[PDB]
Amino acid sequence: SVQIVYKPVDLSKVTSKCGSLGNIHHKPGGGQVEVKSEKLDFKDRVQSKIGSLDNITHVPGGGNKKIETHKLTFR
Amino acid sequence: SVQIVYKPVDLSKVTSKCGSLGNIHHKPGGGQVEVKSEKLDFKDRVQSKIGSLDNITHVPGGGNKKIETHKLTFR
Amino acid sequence: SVQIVYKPVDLSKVTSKCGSLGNIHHKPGGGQVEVKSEKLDFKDRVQSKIGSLDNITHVPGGGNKKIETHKLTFR
Amino acid sequence: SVQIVYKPVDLSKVTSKCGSLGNIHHKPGGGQVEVKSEKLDFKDRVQSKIGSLDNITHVPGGGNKKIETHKLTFR
Amino acid sequence: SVQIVYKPVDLSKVTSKCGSLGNIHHKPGGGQVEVKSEKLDFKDRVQSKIGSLDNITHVPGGGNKKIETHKLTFR
């Protein structure tokens, strides 16, 4: 006979306290972008990005995470 | 016979306290970007990025993480 | 017979206290980027990045982590 | 004869710039005030203050001042 | 004859720049105030203050001042 008893117990705390969170300034691409092109040959795909792109200001009050994986495999 | 008793117990704390969090200044690409091109041949794919791209200001109050993996395998 | 009793016990603390956290200044790419090109031949893929890219200001109040792995394998 | 020509000229600047101003915490009278009195005689005026009084948090963005006095006196 | 020509000229600058100003913590009277009194005689005025009083947090971004006095007196 085979007897498996999977009883994981969890009393866990992921906690944060923050008194104040602020005065965040993110200023990307303040300056000047000059792009000049003359006599260009492209014989395949072109991807171009010019300026201020994909900029992030992420300010979570918590921002806490808990990943928990359980796996039982019988063969 | 086979008897497996998987009883992991967890009373765990991932904790932060912060009195104040602030006055963050992120200023990427303040200056001047001049790109001049004359007589260029491309015979395959081109990817170009010019300026201020993919800049991040990440300011979590907590920012705490707990990864926990459990794995039981019987064969 | 075979008897396995997996009882790991955890009373663990990953803790931080911080009275103040602030006045962070990140200023990447303050100066001047001049790129001049004349008579260039490319016969394969080109990737170009010019300016201020992929810059990070990461300021977590906590920033604490706990990784915990449990693995029981019977054969 | 008497000739008075009072021509004071002023081209003056009192200036401030501030990128961020914040995360001010003023916590007066956190603790415990116990006042016990038995058999007190007062034969004149009494003024009493007990606790947290007249506390100030003054946070001006500018807070700049210019005093200018002109006085001409003829006798 | 008497000829007075009061032409004071002013091209003056009182200036400040500040990139960030913050994370100020003022915590007066954290602890415990125990006042016990038995058999006190007062035959004149009493002023009493007990606890956390008249505490200031003054945080001006500028805080700049210019005093200028002009005085002309003829007799």
Curated annotation (Swiss-Prot), chains A, B, C, D, E:
<feature type="modified residue" description="Omega-N-methylarginine">
    <location>
        <position position="45"/>
    </location>
</feature>
<feature type="cross-link" description="Glycyl lysine isopeptide (Lys-Gly) (interchain with G-Cter in ubiquitin); alternate">
    <location>
        <position position="43"/>
    </location>
</feature>
<feature type="modified residue" description="N6-acetyllysine; alternate">
    <location>
        <position position="17"/>
    </location>
</feature>
<feature type="cross-link" description="Glycyl lysine isopeptide (Lys-Gly) (interchain with G-Cter in ubiquitin); in PHF-tau">
    <location>
        <position position="49"/>
    </location>
</feature>
<feature type="site" description="Not glycated">
    <location>
        <position position="17"/>
    </location>
</feature>
<feature type="glycosylation site" description="N-linked (Glc) (glycation) lysine; in PHF-tau; in vitro">
    <location>
        <position position="65"/>
    </location>
</feature>
<feature type="site" description="Not glycated">
    <location>
        <position position="71"/>
    </location>
</feature>
<feature type="modified residue" description="Phosphoserine">
    <location>
        <position position="20"/>
    </location>
</feature>
<feature type="modified residue" description="N6-acetyllysine; alternate">
    <location>
        <position position="27"/>
    </location>
</feature>
<feature type="modified residue" description="Phosphoserine">
    <location>
        <position position="52"/>
    </location>
</feature>
<comment type="function">
    <text>Promotes microtubule assembly and stability, and might be involved in the establishment and maintenance of neuronal polarity. The C-terminus binds axonal microtubules while the N-terminus binds neural plasma membrane components, suggesting that tau functions as a linker protein between both. Axonal polarity is predetermined by TAU/MAPT localization (in the neuronal cell) in the domain of the cell body defined by the centrosome. The short isoforms allow plasticity of the cytoskeleton whereas the longer isoforms may preferentially play a role in its stabilization.</text>
</comment>
<feature type="cross-link" description="Glycyl lysine isopeptide (Lys-Gly) (interchain with G-Cter in ubiquitin)">
    <location>
        <position position="71"/>
    </location>
</feature>
<feature type="modified residue" description="N6,N6-dimethyllysine; alternate">
    <location>
        <position position="7"/>
    </location>
</feature>
<feature type="cross-link" description="Glycyl lysine isopeptide (Lys-Gly) (interchain with G-Cter in ubiquitin); alternate">
    <location>
        <position position="39"/>
    </location>
</feature>
<feature type="modified residue" description="Phosphoserine; by PHK">
    <location>
        <position position="1"/>
    </location>
</feature>
<feature type="modified residue" description="Phosphoserine; by PHK">
    <location>
        <position position="48"/>
    </location>
</feature>
<feature type="cross-link" description="Glycyl lysine isopeptide (Lys-Gly) (interchain with G-Cter in ubiquitin); alternate">
    <location>
        <position position="13"/>
    </location>
</feature>
<feature type="modified residue" description="N6-acetyllysine; alternate">
    <location>
        <position position="43"/>
    </location>
</feature>
<feature type="repeat" description="Tau/MAP 3">
    <location>
        <begin position="2"/>
        <end position="32"/>
    </location>
</feature>
<feature type="modified residue" description="N6-acetyllysine; alternate">
    <location>
        <position position="13"/>
    </location>
</feature>
<feature type="site" description="Not glycated">
    <location>
        <position position="13"/>
    </location>
</feature>
<feature type="repeat" description="Tau/MAP 4">
    <location>
        <begin position="33"/>
        <end position="64"/>
    </location>
</feature>
<feature type="cross-link" description="Glycyl lysine isopeptide (Lys-Gly) (interchain with G-Cter in ubiquitin); alternate">
    <location>
        <position position="65"/>
    </location>
</feature>
<feature type="cross-link" description="Glycyl lysine isopeptide (Lys-Gly) (interchain with G-Cter in ubiquitin); in PHF-tau">
    <location>
        <position position="7"/>
    </location>
</feature>
<protein>
    <recommendedName>
        <fullName>Microtubule-associated protein tau</fullName>
    </recommendedName>
</protein>
<comment type="subunit">
    <text>Interacts with MARK1, MARK2, MARK3 and MARK4. Interacts with PSMC2 through SQSTM1. Interacts with SQSTM1 when polyubiquitinated. Interacts with FKBP4. Binds to CSNK1D. Interacts with SGK1. Interacts with PIN1. Interacts with LRRK2. Interacts with LRP1, leading to endocytosis; this interaction is reduced in the presence of LRPAP1/RAP.</text>
</comment>
<feature type="cross-link" description="Glycyl lysine isopeptide (Lys-Gly) (interchain with G-Cter in ubiquitin); alternate">
    <location>
        <position position="17"/>
    </location>
</feature>
<feature type="modified residue" description="N6-acetyllysine; alternate">
    <location>
        <position position="65"/>
    </location>
</feature>
<feature type="modified residue" description="N6-acetyllysine; alternate">
    <location>
        <position position="39"/>
    </location>
</feature>
<feature type="site" description="Not glycated">
    <location>
        <position position="39"/>
    </location>
</feature>
<feature type="site" description="Not glycated">
    <location>
        <position position="36"/>
    </location>
</feature>
<feature type="glycosylation site" description="N-linked (Glc) (glycation) lysine; in PHF-tau; in vitro">
    <location>
        <position position="49"/>
    </location>
</feature>
<feature type="cross-link" description="Glycyl lysine isopeptide (Lys-Gly) (interchain with G-Cter in ubiquitin); alternate">
    <location>
        <position position="27"/>
    </location>
</feature>
<feature type="glycosylation site" description="N-linked (Glc) (glycation) lysine; in PHF-tau; in vitro">
    <location>
        <position position="43"/>
    </location>
</feature>
<feature type="modified residue" description="N6-acetyllysine; alternate">
    <location>
        <position position="7"/>
    </location>
</feature>
<feature type="site" description="Not glycated">
    <location>
        <position position="7"/>
    </location>
</feature>
<feature type="site" description="Not glycated">
    <location>
        <position position="27"/>
    </location>
</feature>
<feature type="site" description="Not glycated">
    <location>
        <position position="66"/>
    </location>
</feature>
